[PDB]
């Protein structure tokens, strides 16, 4: 038979509910499971789905160049094949033989989907443009001025057409405001200003970080590109340290930082989390870099080319996408209100302001009129 | 942070500013009359005019104070209303309780009243502040 | 002549039911139901008296994976215990390989049952829902304050202050009425574009309304063995039930869907769904057309002579409309029950209540003012 | 091999676009085609898809009891099996052996889907209930009466609260009317009052008919049931004759009689038409009767029982429904505006009426006042 | 040393392009593009000078069903006519069984292209669209008639007529403003809840926007060989095209989608879609994520020695970000271009226009009245 | 629960609550005039002017009541009210204006009528409200 | 079937009914004056009052007729407007064209005018009918 | 195309179209008073009253113009207008009311200023309208 070294990571390698009540390949399940199943159906061989010892993917020690992980297993004969989400790199290909990527991905941005924005003090003006509001104000005062001028500059046939046109105007204005506000309140379209990493680089209102150490952090250390150089400068020059300890830690930090944080991670895991309840996350923008997961096999073997051809036949047959849609989307768990004062507080502020203003004006007008009348 | 009491409080601030102005005007008028106490008929007609303005400036007092108290009630407030109540009691008492000798008390009353309202003003502001951020 | 043809059946309503006083009656008259009149017509056609009997196991028939034995009326027929079955027997392949089913006397399928949306009771002061009372009180007190300030201004200054208070009040009332109107329009529109259901897909897509079936039966078996996208998705959902959508008895599903507001649906044979919809409390309804297509049929031994005559009689009755008559009788004539968009006043009552209250208060104020004026001016 | 007699009716038996450019079973296509294909795959036999001579289904002559149609072929040896939409009846089963129905159906009602109703003169009142309109009118006049009574019955503190409550009232009324009218105009839900045949029996605004002669007409002649007896009475006692010559004739009559006609036909053909463009039809209610289409075979044969078992295995396997969804729905072709005066003409009528009324009132008031003043 | 390694390529932009003055330049300097700098880096890594060449047939490679011969650069490599290919070569199975592809230097897939929705120009008097002018004229003349009648009434009868005209005008203006507001709200809401597209399914469901592809190629071949519900439905639709959605050249699809308003979409490799979106007239955009997943790779004979070094160099560059740099250069730096909900005044201009017109007319009337009054009263 | 008739009853109730006091003031003005120079002449003529003034209101509101109860399909109350309508019509035709007896008797009768219509409207509205 | 001209036509019907009433009143007043041609000062004051009412009933004529013509124009009508035009011409002519002798013509004019309007009325109705169903 | 500034210019234009005639009438009233018993006294005092009356309008509309051009970010027109504002302020401080020369000279200067501001506003609005 064949030795199939892997590692426990969902939705690739998962233990069924009856893992303890079963002793065999039926124990495990996920993407790579059906992948190896189809690979065997193509090549027609035997295989026992073992697991890696150190619970790692693969790397070397800078003091003894010893390969720890599935890489060490395939290099030191401990394994025969590694059907796992193993990233393809230069160092690893210099020693073993990778297959063509069966799953392409790249770094991506996870955030919390836009929650209902705070109403905002002067939000009732959003339905209309600022310029329209100023134009309305000045039209009102100008009309008042004209009404005043048609009383002292003349003894009506002038106030009539003026009243009619003002009626038309205020009618249309009321209607437009009501209609646009109703459209706003009915559908409630939600959007964020972050459709890419450039937006994050251009702002600092929200923070972003990465795993305390890993391929992503190293790529950001390197990648001497304007945007990514700026992002590395920010993340390194920022307190508190945006970095986190593990994936779930950053996920929760994003879940408890509604409008503050944004994590960078493999797009696959990002989609996985996005499809798992509570459904309080979302992946934004597009992949920053481009990488791929591919099968592994020692520098010299017999199933390498067969596995490559099988991967290509699957990718061209419309199978890998099916397994992905199954383990990510089909399995995916993530398949009006009244109006509060906070939405209109500005109206009452304006009212009280104008009211106190009128009161003060009347007070000074009286203090002048009565003073002039009595004293003279 | 609105509480529905910030609106009542700021409205009370405005009305109390007007009321302080009116009280100062009343004090000044009473001082002018004390000083005053066909130029004789002129001064008589002048005190007639001032008394006319006074009588015209009575209903606003009751109106604004009743509004203050009823709005404080409708806003579930209970520590301020109880402080404005004595003034409403005094106002309703004035009817079945009430110029050379009247002023001997009137001035005093007016003066004190002003002070009260003034204090109230400050306090109102204080409240809305402690009610506008929490 | 004949030998009092045996007739094994089952006690499922309204197909077969015990009369109110079965304890003082004979067998043929003891029971009553659709199947009873059907057997009467069958006898009238073939010309033979019969004797009815109930099945011991209270089942229809199936093969045990260990004994490979036929139970229920199927076994009663195969094992000579019965001469013919006139009960609702879902025609199937495994069941046809041992007996000679007749033609379908009643076609049916799988259908949905929900809570009849009779929940329409608007609160008296529901017109205040669009925005909190915290705003209505502000509006009232703003009105009175503006009136007070206008009074003061145009009293002690008998203008400009009046013009600016008028403008600000114009702005205020504009925004207020517009906000109320817009939120009310949102409420109405949202409440309007909600089609309850028209088919299974309406459930396959949404998730708020959970759909469940019996613990294990022909329904779940059809779902598992289904190759359709909609039914496959529904089976995946039910397999992903949290909590359990399934039940161990149809009455449990009925009780829980009646308890649920509108977020539960039950799948079952359209026949029982209709019988229920025509039963108390008459709070359920059948909407979506039958998903599958099957039919009940009369059974008989694989080598019996009745088959020909009974099939001929079934077709004769289906053509004469007698079966439709018996259906309309036992489902609608015997039914425990018989069978908009605009705004009704119930939504606006509070408006007229407060209107009349204010009118009466104004009349009272005017009367007391008239009195306190005339009496205190003319005489005293 | 086997002789498979059928008849040309869609979507059961259809000629491909290259019928002339092909000589074989590939010529035909439809539901029954794949049906016979699966039947052969089950029984593993040979078959040549021939066609019936007289282009009929099956019946007998009352003068010579000769079977014309596929029935005549199976009875007189001209055919071996008839995989066609053959209706199962008593007369036919007395002579041959039918299979269990593979397609159940029944009579059904076809109409034209509700087109935009004519606006209606007094339609602007639809958003609100009639009683609400009368209540509004009487509230307005009562308020006017009270305002009048607070001027002569008293010299304001009464008109103030009255004006305020009237402001509140008119505000809420305007808002309710606007909101409900917007809801009406946004979604535009369309419905017809015909959800069953009982509705047709209860009314006569629209007419209904059947094929000039056929199974449906005979069933309606018989069927001594209240509803169907009434419908037969109507159709027989009605001019012009609701009956038609063929299916397409009644279909077109319904298509050119937007709100007048409604055809009764097999539910299968009804759905077929409903799915074929122009998409100006719809099936309403539920099946009136219950019938089924089943395979045919002479009184004595060898493939009868095998065909029955195959039909049952297919119905239980989830195949017939797939073929139906394919040939009816998958193949199915049938997969805001401004406001016109006709919607509000009643408003202008009311305005002009009240206006002329006020004018006449003023005229008589003047003729009385000036007359009394001058003459006295 | 080496033997001037041959490099067969193809003339597809922006991968390889002829400089503005190729007629006065050498081969390596004659062409320019992503692939050129890629080959430069490959040479710098492996340390070998090369000589570029174009493919005669202008194709990539395929097997003729009759000759079973490899054409294009594939044949040039298999038949010794070429040493290596540095052109975009979609990795495939049949193509891998004869050569040793390198690792993907550029991942991509199938994506959508539509017309950038820059169509936003509101008419000056668009606020009259909610209801016909036939109603606006009635409204105007009703206003003037009501004013005239009030004038007459309260002139020759200096009431009741006034009260009833006021009530009827109240009703009229109520209904009118409400109708206008409601129809405008309908317009706005409908225009608001229309998401253009976010994925293929958004097209599979709807029908207004037709989606087409090339006449015959890898795209239609992927669709036919697809086992997915969405892609199967889209393939059925395209097979049910009326008129033809397909085209024989990508430029045809581009031209017709630019001519179409918003009801056409084109499917193609995301790479060309991006290159176009960054080209004039810059009226197209890519929205939906890549449907499939594939990659271009460097080819070489099945038994060549370059394979190892070239794969190592490709991975080294993918890790160093050099390929991302070349992409950002040849797609964005070399781009022909760089890269709401509220109501704008443009929708309401006519209102203020008529307002100012009426104000000026009123001032004119007041002036002429003042003159005709003072002059004709004081002196004459 | 509302049926739009409770509203007409409420309105008629609010108006009759004023009519009852109106009639009471008529009776008291009659008691005053029962006393039977410029002082008394004016003190009586002012009240007589207030009286001769408030005549249109009664007819207006009675027409209002009848119209409302006619539009609400409530014919019983209309039949109860039409007698006073014919009475007011005949009064307008010929009304005395020696006259004290007729005035006070009409005032008392109309007062009792209004006070009873009060309870009638109240009970009818109560019945209509709980007619669910 | 509204045409936008039914509204104009019915409005014209209403205004023309009022105008016919006013014309009949003018004819009756002119007849009363002809009959008439300190009771002497009483009759003088009475003809003064009637002349005052007449002068008050001049602007309405021009107003309603100008409204008729302008609405007929705005409604694209061309067969009726042309018929009302001569009356507007006569009205504008009256200014630079114009009691014991005036009546000798006035009456006649008024009479004829009435007739015209009367006819117009009918015609208007006719139109709206032929304009209300088509 | 609109930018909300064309509106301020339109409003100022409509108001200056009245101001120009206003100043013209001032000049004509001055020409009348240049004539320098009850007949002439009244015929001159009525015009003087009309004059002394129409003073608040000019200040009101000038404040309006300055406020608008300030809120429209148009500081150039505000700088052009502030001199007349300071002039009106000093006038209110001390205005002569012998006086004929000053009155007519101020009237002529203000008339020319308004007539030129007319064309200025017109050209500015035209430029703003076609600034697309």
Swiss-Prot record, chains A, D:
Binding sites annotated in the UniProt record for L-glutamate: 85, 87, 92, 215-216, 266
Cell location: Cell membrane; Postsynaptic cell membrane; Postsynaptic density membrane
Sites marked Crucial to convey clamshell closure to channel opening: 194
Extracellular side, ranges: 178-343
Protein purpose: Ionotropic glutamate receptor that functions as a ligand-gated cation channel, gated by L-glutamate and glutamatergic agonists such as alpha-amino-3-hydroxy-5-methyl-4-isoxazolepropionic acid (AMPA), quisqualic acid, and kainic acid. L-glutamate acts as an excitatory neurotransmitter at many synapses in the central nervous system and plays an important role in fast excitatory synaptic transmission.
Subunit structure: Homotetramer or heterotetramer of pore-forming glutamate receptor subunits. Tetramers may be formed by the dimerization of dimers. May interact with MPP4. Forms a ternary complex with GRIP1 and CSPG4. Interacts with ATAD1 in an ATP-dependent manner. ATAD1-catalyzed ATP hydrolysis disrupts binding to ATAD1 and to GRIP1 and leads to AMPAR complex disassembly. Interacts with GRIP2. Interacts with GRIP1. Interacts with NSF via its C-terminus. Interacts with CACNG2, PICK1 and GRIP2. Interacts with GRIA1 and SYNDIG1. Part of a complex containing GRIA2, NSF and NAPA and/or NAPB.
The name this protein goes by in its record: Glutamate receptor 2
Shown part of the complete sequence: 415 to 845 of 883
Curated annotation (Swiss-Prot), chains F, H:
Sequence intervals crossing the membrane: 10-30, 60-80, 111-131
Keywords, comma-separated and alphabetical: Cell membrane, Membrane, Postsynaptic cell membrane, Synapse, Transmembrane, Transmembrane helix
Matches recorded under Pfam families: Cornichon
Protein topology in the membrane: Multi-pass membrane protein
Sections of the chain in a coiled coil: none
An annotated GO BP: vesicle-mediated transport
Gene Ontology cellular-component terms listed: AMPA glutamate receptor complex; dendritic shaft; glutamatergic synapse; postsynaptic membrane
Membrane side Lumenal: residue ranges: 31-59, 132
Entry superkingdom: Eukaryota
Subcellular location: Postsynaptic cell membrane
Complex formation: Acts as an auxiliary subunit for AMPA-selective glutamate receptors (AMPARs). Found in a complex with GRIA1, GRIA2, GRIA3, GRIA4, CNIH2, CACNG2, CACNG3, CACNG4, CACNG5, CACNG7 and CACNG8.
Function according to Swiss-Prot or TrEMBL: Regulates the trafficking and gating properties of AMPA-selective glutamate receptors (AMPARs). Promotes their targeting to the cell membrane and synapses and modulates their gating properties by regulating their rates of activation, deactivation and desensitization.
Protein's name according to its UniProt entry: Protein cornichon homolog 3
Gene coding for it: Cnih3
């Amino acid at each position: 038979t064949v030795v199939v070294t892997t590692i426990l990571e969902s939705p690739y390698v998962m233990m069924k509910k009856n893992h303890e009540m079963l002793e065999g390949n039926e124990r495990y399940e996920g993407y790579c499971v059906d992948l190896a199943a189809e690979i065997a159906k193509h090549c027609g061989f035997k295989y026992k789905l073992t697991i890696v010892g150190d619970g790692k993917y693969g790397a070397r020690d800078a003091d003894t160049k010893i390969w720890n992980g599935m890489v060490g297993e395939l290099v030191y004969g401990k394994a025969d094949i590694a059907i796992a989400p193993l990233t393809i790199t230069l160092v690893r290909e210099e020693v073993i033989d990778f297959s063509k990527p069966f799953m392409s991905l790249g770094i991506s941005i996870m955030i919390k989907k836009p929650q209902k924005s705070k109403p905002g003090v002067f939000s009732f003006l959003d339905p209309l443009a600022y310029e329209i509001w100023m134009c309305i104000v000045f039209a009102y005062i100008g009309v008042s001025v004209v009404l005043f001028l048609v009383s002292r500059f003349s003894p009506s046939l002038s106030g009539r057409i003026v009243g009619g046109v003002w009626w038309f105007f205020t009618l249309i204005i009321i209607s437009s405001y009501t209609a646009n506000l109703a459209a706003f309140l009915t559908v409630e379209r939600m959007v964020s200003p972050i459709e890419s990493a450039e937006d994050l680089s251009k702002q600092t209102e929200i923070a972003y970080g990465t795993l305390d150490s890993g391929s992503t952090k190293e790529f950001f250390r390197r990648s001497k590109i304007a945007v990514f150089d700026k992002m590395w400068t920010y993340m390194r020059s920022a307190e508190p340290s945006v970095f986190v300890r593990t994936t779930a830690e950053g996920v929760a930090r994003v879940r408890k930082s509604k409008g503050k944080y944004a994590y960078l991670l493999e797009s696959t895991m990002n989609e996985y989390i996005e499809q798992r309840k509570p459904c309080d996350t979302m992946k934004v923008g597009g992949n920053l870099d481009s990488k791929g997961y591919g099968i592994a096999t020692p520098k010299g073997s017999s199933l390498g080319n067969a596995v490559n051809l099988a991967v290509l036949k699957l990718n061209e047959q419309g199978l890998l996408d099916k397994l992905k849609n199954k383990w990510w989307y089909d399995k995916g768990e993530c398949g009006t209100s009244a109006l509060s004062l906070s939405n209109v507080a500005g109206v009452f502020y304006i009212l009280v302001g104008g009211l106190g203003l009128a009161m003060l004006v009347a007070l000074i007008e009286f203090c002048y009129k009565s003073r002039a009348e009595a004293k003279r | 942070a609105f509480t529905f009491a910030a609106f009542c409080y700021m409205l009370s601030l405005v009305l109390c500013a007007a009321l302080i102005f009116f009280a100062i005007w009343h004090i000044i008028a009473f001082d002018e009359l004390r000083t005053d106490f066909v130029h004789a008929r002129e001064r008589l007609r002048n005190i007639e005019r001032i008394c006319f303005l006074l009588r015209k400036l009575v209903l606003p007092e009751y109106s604004i104070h009743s509004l203050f108290c009823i709005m404080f009630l409708c806003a579930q407030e209970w520590l301020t209303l109880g402080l404005n109540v004595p003034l409403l009691f005094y106002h309703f008492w004035r009817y079945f309780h009430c110029n050379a000798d009247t002023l001997s008390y009137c001035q005093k009353e007016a003066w004190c009243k002003l002070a009260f309202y003034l204090l109230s003003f400050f306090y109102y502001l204080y409240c809305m502040i402690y009610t506008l951020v929490s």
